[PDB]
A paper describes a structure:
The bacterial lectin BC2L‐C expressed in B. cenocepacia is an interesting drug target involved in bacterial adhesion and subsequent deadly infection to the host. For BC2L‐C, the C‐terminal domain (LecB like) specifically binds to mannose, while the N‐terminal domain (BC2L‐C‐nt) has been structurally characterized as a novel fucose‐binding domain with a trimeric TNF‐α‐like architecture. Thus, BC2L‐C represents a novel type of superlectin with dual specificity for fucose and mannose in the N‐ and C‐terminal domains, respectively. BC2L‐C as a virulence factor binds to carbohydrates present on the epithelial cells of the host.
The crystal structures of complexes evidenced some promising pockets on the protein surface near the fucose binding site. The occurrence of such pockets in the apo‐protein needed to be verified and therefore, we solved the crystal structure of the apo form of BC2L‐C‐nt at high resolution (1.5 Å). The asymmetric unit in the P63 space group contains one monomer and crystal symmetry was applied to build the trimer for comparison with other structures. Root‐mean‐squares values of 0.21 Å and 0.24 Å were obtained when comparing with the trimer complexed with MeSe‐α‐L‐Fuc and Globo‐H, respectively. Comparison of binding sites did not display significant differences in the amino acid of fucose binding pockets and environment. Only a minor difference is observed at the surface loop (Asn52‐Phe54), that is involved in the interaction with methyl group of N‐acetylgalactosamine (GalNAc) in the complex with Globo‐H. Likewise, small differences in the conformation of the N‐ and C‐terminal residues were noticed due to H‐bond interaction between them. The changes in the conformation of the termini further caused a small displacement (0.6 to 1.0 Å) of surface loops (Val28‐Asp35, Asp95‐Val100). Analysis of water molecules involved in bridging fucose to protein indicated that the more buried one (W1) is conserved in all structures, while the more exposed one (W2) moves by 1.9 Å in the apo structure. The new crystal structure therefore confirms that the region surrounding the fucose binding site is of interest for drug design.
Residue numbers in the entry:
A (entry chain A), B (entry chain A), C (entry chain A): 1 to 131
The structure:
């Protein structure tokens, strides 16, 4: 099966100065017997929000056992937003499995001390391609 | 053909307390003779906006004949935004066709009574994968 | 190989009243011997920002040698935002290669004179499908 997916509807609220795994957003590539070719990986966090005192936001990353392959963030445009609105976020990266990839995961990291909120659907998806 | 797509450039402006189809964002899976395996579905609404009086926004969903499989929203961070800016939105879900899926559609639902606006490109895409 | 990708971590800051290529976001389809079937193309700019004096934003497009196939934008909800926050943006389009497509690129265009900022990861991805 060339389509892999994991999805969640919540995670414990946390702050982090470093990239930390988003629990449940994990694809086991080795366990699927995929050892070569490429994966197009999509991290989709459609409804996150950040709480903080200093232009809040969330960094998200796609990581393998080799670490972060791609990342990005959303941030609010106000020091302390009136309400910390829902800021849809998608990240897309293509990785060579041949180089020794055995898992893929989503990770997150605070912007300026923000608490990080997922309280609804979020997914981590991959499509396997071979020549 | 394992790639399916539908796209629109507008829809009638409406409010809805329930998920209602976004006209044109519909993939006919049965008609394509796809009866087994998985679909990775992307709902891409890159340039929506919501008009309202109370922190406006839009919920979007991916639905089949079996109902909603994934959803999320954007919301503004001000009670009545200065201007209701364009809030890009993407949603990604992977569904088992074997379980009896015959169509896939995008749907939307008001946040707090918002009118819902698409006046430019939006797409619903799927990639079919089989083991 | 049915998966194509290009990624960047920055681009020179520019303004543009027209769609102009985002340097590095280019897939050479002809060079890959792909002459028929479909491509699902994702333009992923997860961490852009716009600087301007009049509700800033960025239009993004997916273009081929035949021009723009899909586009959209983000805009801020304040005339001059307190801080020009990071506004994640994804665009998804499906194109018929048979119709004479030889390359795919990401492009951008100012909203109301905005300077356009990418200073971190951004990607252009494609999956090739044939019947």
């Amino acid at each position: 099966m060339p389509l892999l997916s994991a999805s969640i509807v919540s995670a414990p609220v946390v702050t982090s100065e470093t990239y930390v795994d988003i629990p449940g957003l994990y694809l086991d590539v080795a366990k699927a017997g995929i050892r070569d070719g490429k994966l197009q990986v999509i991290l989709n966090v459609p409804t996150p929000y950040a709480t903080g005192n200093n232009f809040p936001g969330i960094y998200f990353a796609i990581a393998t056992n080799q670490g972060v392959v791609a990342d990005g963030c959303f941030t609010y445009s106000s020091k302390v937003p009136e309400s910390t609105g829902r800021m849809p976020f998608t990240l897309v990266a293509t990785i060579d499995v041949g180089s020794g990839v055995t898992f893929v995961k989503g990770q997150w990291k605070s912007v300026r001390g923000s608490a990080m909120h997922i309280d609804s659907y979020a997914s981590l998806s991959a499509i396997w391609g071979t020549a």
